[PDB]
């Protein structure tokens, strides 16, 4: 984002407040736009944004989109008990595959990884 008077800034989402914009805030924004020499968004563009928000909020996600969002949050997932159990089970399956294939090098790494992940309370 960017203030008109100030410069560009990268901000996270939680900084924004759910409270509505007050009259002096919008007036100060208009004064900053006039100082920089900019204009306000057109009413046609305002309606286009409103329709875009309503369509996006009322949209129905597809299976592929839902799976992509789930994979994205799984990448963001630091830890979750169900997911840790599933990962440990998958690692155990990979470990038995490596043991049955007589691969003495992979199994040590999988055991070390399981030891690091494990030791619950």
């Amino acid at each position: 984002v960017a203030f008109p008077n100030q410069k560009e800034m990268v901000r996270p989402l939680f900084v924004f407040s759910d409270s509505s914009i007050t009259h002096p805030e919008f007036d100060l924004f208009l004064r900053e736009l006039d100082a920089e020499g900019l204009s306000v968004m057109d009413l046609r563009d305002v309606d286009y944004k409103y329709h875009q928000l309503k369509e996006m909020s009322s949209r129905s996600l597809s299976n592929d989109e839902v799976n992509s969002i789930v994979k994205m949050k799984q990448s963001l997932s630091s830890n979750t008990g169900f997911n840790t159990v599933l990962k440990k089970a998958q690692l155990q399956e990979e470990l038995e595959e490596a043991r049955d294939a007589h691969d003495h090098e992979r199994v040590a790494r999988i055991e070390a990884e399981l030891k690091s992940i494990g030791a619950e309370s």
């Binding site: 989402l13 939680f14 924004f16 407040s17 759910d18 509505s20 914009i21 009259h23 919008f26 306000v40 968004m41 057109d42 009413l43 046609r44 305002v46 944004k49 409103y50 928000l53 909020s57």
Partner: peptide, 20 residues
């Protein structure tokens, strides 16, 4: 081409909960 009023901006309020 008309300027946007306060109510027009209020129609497109997108809260932090809505962002999440």
């Amino acid at each position: 081409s008309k300027p946007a009023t306060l109510s027009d901006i209020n129609k497109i309020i997108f809260g932090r909960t809505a962002m999440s």
